Point group: D2
Chain length 176, copies 4
């Protein structure tokens, strides 16, 4: 809780345009699979990205969600990744696309991929809106990236700052 | 069951209606002063929540619950509770369809125990005909007859959640 | 995490004897109900008490469990009581006995009773192994009490001290 | 289905067998030095856990999980995860019956990802005949034939969990 301002990093229109492209790419990849497809969102951060993204995915798919253990940025480095809420549906034999808002360290996401892989989906890929590779701690396969971004603390579009700013239609950055 | 899907409420009409809802919601809670939170019932309300919260011009938090779903006489149970506290906060439950009102009626009671400052419901679709339990609903996007609709988060055997419009399922025979 | 010792407060044999009595009383109360009965344990603390107690309850019943939000002793006074894991079964129209290890302030237990009451069981009662009334903050109906105890920090028999001592077969007290 | 319940494994034999199990478990982990935790799969293992941990003469934590149960080809899902971390700890999964081994096999894989120091399984009952997936089981209370048993945490349509013995259900006709 410290005095700050929020500057725009990615305007609403740019996000919309990029997600349209992501949609085309994801559609092109999975259109001929013939197996069931499901987009899996990591709550809470990816709810907005999921809503906009799945509307641009022109393939019959299911939408499902998952809540993994959060903790701080410092305790997440030393604590187990736990399932606070598992999927509602099966993914065995299905094309699964994990929908993430932002990959910073990539710790939690890495563990989540491992967990879902045990369920033997036909395929398992990740789509993140934002990637901050300067902050990457764990090597993790990421098939779709909306934006590779600077080393900034970002907010908006589902992403929060102490539970604040999730409803912003753009990606902003916190300036102390 | 062989079927098809026709547009009932176009994407453009949904967007317009939500913008209006956002203005109404903004107006009711603008001078509250207390923390505000929009609470979505998963999975159905995720898309409605995304668009709606972007039209609410009040600083608020977004949270989610998952209540037990059995289909069309069992206990309403919490599969996933809120992540944050709501005591002393303005709380708006965000729902996709109100039909029988059973689950939502119980979810409201459960949240009411936590003593929020206020507690209200916003639903995209309302089917007044199928109501079994009378539950107050302050904000309503559309009132429809007893039609089986899909899209915009609403599914049919897990299908069609990703449609940008509300559509009607036409059974073929 | 501070240097301490554990002294016995209620020896294993005394717990066994008292639970036998509790069993007789609970049996006498519910033997003629004719409706289904379920004992509901609040995890993790009441797992041992539940195992021993239900074996002394000579009435056909179901065993179910529930995990409510924990937090510290200081944050539990200002945070909502949340359901981390709800019951597996319905309780509507059933005789429900909530099985608790210890009632200190009684905050969390109070809220849990409220939540279960919404499901309209035929009856709803509470059985706690230990009651510490000197520390009671909220007035809550408690139908069965194993022991009313001094203002001591107790451990053992499911009850922990920073996750420690749950497996002790007796009730002990922490001495700094 | 009309039935009755006869004693198969008396309360006294269960107690004796568990005391022995406690000694074996105590011996294997006494000189480990790392934190130890017993992990029970709910609901079946709550009674077995209670008695077993009281016979384990090693300082340990007790925790629980609830995995998806569907009955006698779906994903194993976590309805309730551990409350505590297990990385670098000696972990003993405490189970009531091993039968097909399906759920337990998946639960072990999930916990294995968290990199505990060691990972083992203790089950009260083993039915080797019904095994579909080979999963290592270090400690076993009793090996039984393919019998439908109840009691000691094990249920039949939610019934008989509170029986202090293992019993067999006799169908009547
Ligand atoms: O710029 C950022 N903006 C808001 N959050 C960030 C940012 N960077 C890292 N975080 C924190 C987390 C998001 O979790 C938010 P929380 O659970 O509410 O504390 C990054 O996602 C997990 P990972 O680092 O493994 O990819
Ligand atoms: O047209 C419809 N299309 C798809 N479903 C419908 C429709 N109509 C009623 N449903 C079923 C349900 C949605 O079920 C919630 P879920 O099982 O968690 O996905 C409406 O809830 C009744 P209410 O909110 O009044 O208690
Ligand atoms: O003597 C005591 N011994 C161990 N614990 C105690 C005692 N006293 C109060 N506690 C803490 C809590 C138990 O929670 C343990 P936690 O979630 O792991 O921190 C008392 O139960 C809740 P309430 O106070 O509302 O009846
Ligand atoms: O004699 C039996 N009596 C009551 N049940 C039995 C028996 N035999 C196999 N079951 C069913 C199950 C118990 O189901 C766990 P739940 O649904 O969460 O309560 C044994 O699990 C098979 P495995 O552990 O090898 O994966
Ligand atoms: Mg996130
Ligand atoms: Mg955060
Ligand atoms: Mg709904
Ligand atoms: Mg407790
Ligand atoms: Mg504690
Ligand atoms: Mg089991």
């Amino acid at each position: 809780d410290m005095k700050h301002t929020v500057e725009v990093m990615i305007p609403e229109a740019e996000i919309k345009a990029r997600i349209a492209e992501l949609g085309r790419q994801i559609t092109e990849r999975y259109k001929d699979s013939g197996s069931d497809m499901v987009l899996v969102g990591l709550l809470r951060g990816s709810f907005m990205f999921m809503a906009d993204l799945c509307r641009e995915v022109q393939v019959s798919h299911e939408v499902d969600f998952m809540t993994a253990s959060s903790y701080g940025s410092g305790m997440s480095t030393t604590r187990d990744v736990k399932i606070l809420k598992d999927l509602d549906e099966d993914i065995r034999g299905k094309d699964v696309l994990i929908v993430e808002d932002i990959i910073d360290s990539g710790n939690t996401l890495s563990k989540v991929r491992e967990i879902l892989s045990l369920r033997e989906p036909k395929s398992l890929a990740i789509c993140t809106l934002l990637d901050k590779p300067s902050r990457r701690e764990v090597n993790v396969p990421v098939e779709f990236i909306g934006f590779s971004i600077p080393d900034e603390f970002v907010v908006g579009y589902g992403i929060d700052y102490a539970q604040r700013y999730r409803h912003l239609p753009y990606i902003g950055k916190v300036i102390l």
